[PDB]
C-alpha cells in the first residue's frame, strides 16, 4: 500500500479495500483471487485451469464455502500444517501461488507461509512394545525438548497418558510432531494377508483420498472427510487391506458395529476366524496371531467399572501393540473420555472417518493433535453431479401456530415452551399431508423427532411404527 | 417511455404555444423523429406539396393488416396539432401546419434557417480526453450525491433545488440528510438516455417566467449539435439556460464558444458487461465492476465486505435488504437490478437446467430465472416481514340509535370509498382519517 489514491467509495470498505495492488494482463487466465490481509481465496469454477487448481488449492486451503459458481477458500495455520506434511515446501507453494494468483501474494501472506512451512519435519513420535519414544533425527532438539517444563538420533521415553499433553506442547512449541508409519520395513508386528476381491471397485474420489494418505508411501495419521454415502467404509477397508496388519474399528453405536463387519466381510477377503466383535452381547477375542476388533468407544473408553469378561479383553488390547485404528464418526473422539481411547490404545497409524467435521463447541480443532491433520475433503456437489450420491430438494415448511396454542406460548416458561410448540396442530396437518402425498408417490419416508413424547404422540394417533431409545435391538 | 414522456409533455402544452414552438427547423426535425413510423411516412409525403389531400386517401395507403397502426399514427399527429383537420364541401379535408411545413422544408432543402443549428468556429478540442472526462465526472458527481455516497464536490444549488422538489432524493431538514426514494431507484435503473430526460423534463416544469418554448428550443437543437466541435454564441433566456446546462455535464465552457458532449448528442433518442455480478445460494455477491458509481448503487442493499481492482465482493444480509426497504425501494425493483446485471455464466447454467428440464418433460416452458430462486424467495419474504404490520389512521363509530341509521351511514362510506372495516354484530365500523370528514359530513346530512 504505497501511493494509492483512495476512492470516494473507499469509506464503505473498513480497511478491507485491497485495490492498492495492481492486476497483470494475464488476469483472464489466472483463476485465483487472494486477499492480502484475511488470507481468503476466491476461485473461479468457470475458467481454464479450474480443475488444475481445484486439487492444489484444497490441499493448502480449507474450504469455508463452495457454492455453485464462486468457490471460497481460506488459508490457516492448521491448513498449512496439513499441506506441508505431504512433500510441500514454501518455494513450491510460492511459485505455484504466483503462477495462479490474479493479485500478487502480499508480503503478509508471504510472511505467513514462511513461518509455518519451515517447522515441519524435525521431530517424530515412535512406538515400540507399547513404549512411546519421542525420537529426533538431530541432537540439537534435546536441548529444547528435555528442558521443556511440561515434559517429564537420541530417543527418550514419555508416559502414555502424557501423550495428550506433549502433542499440545508440540503445537505450542515451534516444532509439531508428525506420525509416519513405515509398514514396508516393519516386520516385528505380525502381518494380516488380505486383499480386495475382484468384484470390488474403487471410485476415483476414494482413490484420491487414499493417495493423499499414502502419498510418500508411509501410512499417515489424519482425517478423511467424505459426504454421507460416499463409501467411507470401503476407504477404511482399503486402508486396512493395504497395510496388512492388526486393525481395529471404533463406532459410537451398536447396530453400526454389525454394519461395519458386514461390509468388511463382503468387500475384502478376511476370513471370519480373524474377526472378533467386542460389544455388550459377545466379548470373545481372537487368539490368532493377528485380526480385527470392531468395537465401540463406550467399551474402550470405560475406566471405572469393567467386569471379568471385559477385563480380559482390555488386557488383550493393551498388551499387544496394534498397527492401525479406524475411528468411524470421528467427530465425537475429542470428547472428555472418548479421547482416552486414542492414548490408551497403542497404534502406529490412526484414521478418522466422519461425514461432518463440525461440532457446537470449539473442540473441533483439537482433532489435529488427537489423530492428525485433515488429509482430503470431497465436495458434496461434485459427487452429486457425478452420480455417486443422490440429489436432495431441501425444503423448510412454515407452519403458523393456531391462536389458542400461541396464547399459552407467551406465558409458558421456556423449558415447557419446547413441548408446547412441538405438537402444534398445524404441524400435524403438514406432517400427515406430506406423508400421505409421498406415500402415494411410492416413497420410503423417515420421520425424525428428538422429543420422545412427541414421537409417541405422532405414532399412536397415526398408527405407524416408532423407534426410540428404550426399544431393544 | 422516452418517446412517450417527451410526446406526452408536448401534448399538454397548449396549441397556442405549440405553434410558436414549431418556428425553428431544428426543433421540428427533432419532433419529427419522435412520431411513429407511419406518422413520419405521411408527414414526409405532405411536406413537399402545397395542396390539400382528403382524409380517406391516406387511409387507402395502409393495408388491411396494418389498419390498427393507422389509428395510433393519426391520433398522435392530431394531438400534437401538426395535422390540421379541415372540413368543407361535405368532405373532411386534411392539411399540414403551415409553420411545420415551412420548418421541415428549410431543413431538408437547406433554406434560410436563422442559425437554428448554430455556427462553427473551427476551434475543435480533443473529445476523448476532455469532453468525455468532463461530462463523465460531472454526471458522475451528481449521481454520487444522489445515491448517498460521500463525495467532496457537492452539486450546485440549481440542480440541488431541482432534485429536492422533485420526487428524486427526498430530503428532510429535521433528519438533515438526503435519501433515495422508490422513484429514485427506478431513475438509477433507467438507462442513461432516459436518466437524462427525467432531469431535463423535471427542469422544464420547474422554470417559471424564461419562456417554455425557448427552453424547449435550446434543448432540441443541442442534440442536433455534433460532439467535438465549436459553436459560437442566442436568446437572452438561453444565456442563463446555457450556464445552467453546465451543472448537468452536458456542455463545457472554458469560462463565448460552447462544446456539446456525448450526453448532448445522446439526448435526441440515439440508438463482459460492466456491472455484471454473481448471485448464488450462499448470498455472496461478486460484481465484476470497477467504478465507484456501480459500487455505490450496489451498497444500497448489499453489505460490502472488500474490494479488488477487478471486482468487488460482498454478501447479501437481512440488515442490507431492510435498509433499502425502509428507504422505499421495493423488492421487485431489487430483483430487476439483479436480473438485468447478471453474469453470462448464470444464464448458461440456467439454460442447461432448462434444456435438461425440457429433455425430461418438454411440456412445461416456464420463464427462466438467471439467479437461483432461493434468493428471490428470501428477498421477497423479508419484504413481507417489513409489511408484517399494516396500520390505518382514522376514527371509530359506535352506539347507533337505529340499525337503519348504521346501515345508511356505513353504506354511504362504502359508496365514497372511505370505509375500511365493519362488523354487523357489534354495529361498529372504522374509517380512514382521510375520509373522516366525509363520513361525518354525511352523518349530519
Amino acid at each position: 500500500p504505497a501511493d494509492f489514491v483512495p476512492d470516494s467509495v473507499s469509506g464503505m470498505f473498513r480497511s478491507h479495500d485491497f485495490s492498492y495492488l495492481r492486476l497483470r494482463p494475464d488476469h483472464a487466465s489466472r483463476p485465483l483471487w487472494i486477499s492480502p490481509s484475511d488470507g481468503r481465496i476466491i476461485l473461479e469454477s468457470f475458467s481454464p485451469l479450474a480443475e488444475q487448481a481445484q486439487d492444489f488449492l484444497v490441499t493448502i486451503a480449507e474450504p469455508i464455502s463452495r457454492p455453485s459458481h464462486i468457490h471460497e477458500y481460506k488459508i490457516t495455520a492448521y491448513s498449512l500444517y496439513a499441506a506441508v506434511s505431504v512433500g510441500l515446501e514454501t518455494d513450491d507453494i510460492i511459485s505455484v501461488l504466483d503462477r495462479l494468483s490474479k493479485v500478487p501474494v502480499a508480503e503478509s501472506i508471504i510472511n505467513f507461509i514462511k513461518g509455518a512451512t519451515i517447522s515441519y519435519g524435525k521431530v517424530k513420535l515412535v512406538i515400540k512394545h507399547n513404549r512411546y519414544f519421542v525420537e529426533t533425527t538431530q541432537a540439537d532438539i534435546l536441548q529444547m525438548l528435555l528442558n521443556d517444563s511440561v515434559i517429564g538420533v537420541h530417543s527418550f521415553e514419555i508416559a502414555n497418558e502424557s501423550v495428550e499433553v506433549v502433542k499440545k506442547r508440540c503445537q505450542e512449541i515451534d516444532y509439531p510432531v508428525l506420525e509416519e508409519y513405515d509398514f514396508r520395513n516393519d516386520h516385528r508386528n505380525p502381518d494380516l494377508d488380505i486383499d480386495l476381491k475382484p468384484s470390488t471397485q474403487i471410485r476415483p474420489y476414494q482413490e484420491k483420498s487414499l493417495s493423499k494418505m499414502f502419498g510418500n508411501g508411509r501410512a499417515r495419521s489424519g482425517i478423511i472427510v467424505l459426504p454421507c454415502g460416499a463409501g467411507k467404509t470401503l476407504v477404511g477397508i482399503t486402508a486396512a487391506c493395504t497395510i496388512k496388519k492388526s486393525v481395529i474399528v471404533l463406532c459410537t453405536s451398536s447396530v453400526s458395529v454389525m454394519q461395519w463387519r458386514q461390509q468388511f466381510l463382503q468387500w475384502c477377503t478376511l476370513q471370519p476366524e480373524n474377526c472378533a466383535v467386542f460389544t455388550s452381547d459377545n466379548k470373545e477375542m481372537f487368539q490368532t496371531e493377528s485380526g480385527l476388533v470392531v468395537s465401540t468407544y463406550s467399551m474402550v473408553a470405560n475406566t471405572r467399572n469393567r467386569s471379568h469378561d471385559s477385563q480380559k479383553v482390555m488386557d488383550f488390547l493393551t498388551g499387544r501393540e496394534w498397527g492401525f485404528i479406524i475411528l468411524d464418526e470421528v467427530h465425537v473422539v475429542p470428547a472428555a473420555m472418548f479421547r482416552r481411547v486414542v492414548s490408551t490404545i497403542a497404534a502406529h497409524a490412526k484414521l478418522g472417518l466422519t461425514a461432518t467435521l463440525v461440532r457446537e463447541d470449539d473442540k473441533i480443532g483439537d482433532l489435529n493433535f488427537l489423530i492428525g491433520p485433515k488429509l482430503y475433503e470431497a465436495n458434496w456437489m461434485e459427487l452429486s453431479q457425478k452420480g455417486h450420491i443422490a440429489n436432495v430438494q431441501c425444503a423448510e415448511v412454515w407452519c403458523p401456530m393456531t391462536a389458542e396454542f400461541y396464547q399459552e406460548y407467551l406465558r409458558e416458561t421456556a423449558r415447557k415452551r419446547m413441548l408446547l410448540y412441538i405438537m402444534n396442530p398445524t404441524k400435524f396437518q403438514a406432517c400427515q399431508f406430506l406423508i400421505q402425498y409421498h406415500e402415494r408417490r411410492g416413497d420410503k419416508i423417515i420421520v425424525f423427532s428428538d422429543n420422545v413424547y412427541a414421537l409417541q404422540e405422532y405414532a399412536l394417533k397415526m398408527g405407524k411404527p416408532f423407534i426410540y431409545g428404550s426399544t431393544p435391538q | 417511455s422516452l418517446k412517450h414522456s417527451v410526446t406526452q409533455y408536448l401534448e399538454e402544452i397548449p396549441q397556442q404555444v405549440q405553434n410558436r414552438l414549431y418556428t425553428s427547423p431544428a426543433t421540428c426535425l427533432a419532433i419529427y423523429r419522435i412520431l411513429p413510423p407511419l406518422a413520419k411516412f405521411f408527414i414526409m409525403a405532405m411536406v413537399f406539396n402545397e395542396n390539400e389531400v382528403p382524409l380517406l386517401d391516406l387511409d387507402k395507403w395502409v393495408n388491411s393488416n396494418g389498419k390498427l397502426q393507422f389509428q395510433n399514427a393519426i391520433k398522435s399527429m392530431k394531438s400534437l396539432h401538426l395535422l390540421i383537420p379541415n372540413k368543407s364541401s361535405g368532405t373532411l379535408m386534411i392539411n399540414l401546419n403551415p409553420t411545420f411545413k415551412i420548418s421541415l422544408r428549410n431543413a431538408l432543402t437547406g433554406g434560410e434557417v436563422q442559425n437554428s443549428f448554430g455556427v462553427v468556429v473551427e476551434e475543435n478540442v480533443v473529445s476523448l480526453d476532455l469532453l468525455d472526462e468532463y461530462s463523465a465526472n460531472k454526471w458522475e458527481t451528481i449521481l454520487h450525491f444522489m445515491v448517498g455516497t460521500p463525495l467532496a464536490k457537492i452539486p450546485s444549488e440549481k440542480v440541488l433545488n431541482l432534485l429536492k422538489h422533485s420526487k428524486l432524493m427526498e430530503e428532510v431538514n429535521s433528519t438533515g440528510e438526503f435519501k433515495i426514494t422508490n422513484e429514485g431507484f427506478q431513475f438509477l435503473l433507467q438507462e442513461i438516455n432516459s436518466q437524462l430526460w427525467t432531469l431535463l423534463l423535471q427542469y422544464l416544469k420547474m422554470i417559471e417566467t424564461m419562456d417554455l418554448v425557448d427552453v424547449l428550443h435550446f434543448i432540441f437543437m443541442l442534440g442536433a449539435l455534433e460532439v467535438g466541435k465549436a459553436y459560437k454564441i442566442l436568446s437572452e433566456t438561453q444565456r442563463i439556460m446555457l450556464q445552467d446546462m453546465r451543472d448537468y455535464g452536458l456542455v463545457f465552457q472554458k469560462h463565448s464558444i460552447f462544446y456539446p458532449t456525448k450526453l448532448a448528442l445522446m439526448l435526441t433518442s440515439d440508438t463482459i458487461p460492466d456491472g455484471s455480478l454473481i448471485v448464488e445460494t450462499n448470498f455472496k455477491i461478486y460484481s465484476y465492476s470497477n467504478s465507484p458509481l456501480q459500487i455505490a448503487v450496489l451498497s444500497l442493499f448489499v453489505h460490502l465486505k472488500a474490494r479488488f481492482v477487478n471486482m468487488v465482493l460482498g454478501q447479501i444480509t437481512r440488515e442490507s435488504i431492510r435498509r433499502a426497504l425502509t428507504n422505499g425501494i421495493t423488492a421487485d425493483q431489487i430483483i430487476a437490478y439483479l436480473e438485468t446485471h447478471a453474469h453470462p455464466q448464470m444464464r448458461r447454467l440456467a439454460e442447461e437446467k432448462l434444456e435438461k428440464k425440457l429433455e425430461l418433460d418438454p411440456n412445461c416452458k416456464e420463464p427462466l430465472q438467471v439467479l437461483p430462486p432461493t434468493v428471490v424467495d428470501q428477498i421477497r419474504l423479508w419484504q413481507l416481514e417489513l409489511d408484517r404490520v399494516i396500520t390505518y389512521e382514522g376514527s371509530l363509530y359506535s352506539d347507533f340509535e337505529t340499525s337503519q341509521e348504521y346501515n345508511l351511514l356505513s353504506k354511504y362510506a362504502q359508496d365514497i370509498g372511505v370505509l375500511l372495516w365493519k362488523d354487523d354484530k357489534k354495529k361498529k365500523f372504522f374509517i380512514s382519517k382521510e375520509g373522516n370528514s366525509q363520513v361525518l359530513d354525511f352523518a349530519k346530512r
Binding site: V397, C399, P400, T402, P425, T426, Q429, A430 | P373, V376, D377, R380, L381, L384
Partner: peptide, 10 residues
C-alpha cells in the same frame, strides 16, 4: 415459489 398464496391448515 409459493410466497404469495394463503396459509396451510384447516
Amino acid at each position: 415459489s409459493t410466497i404469495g398464496k394463503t396459509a396451510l391448515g384447516r
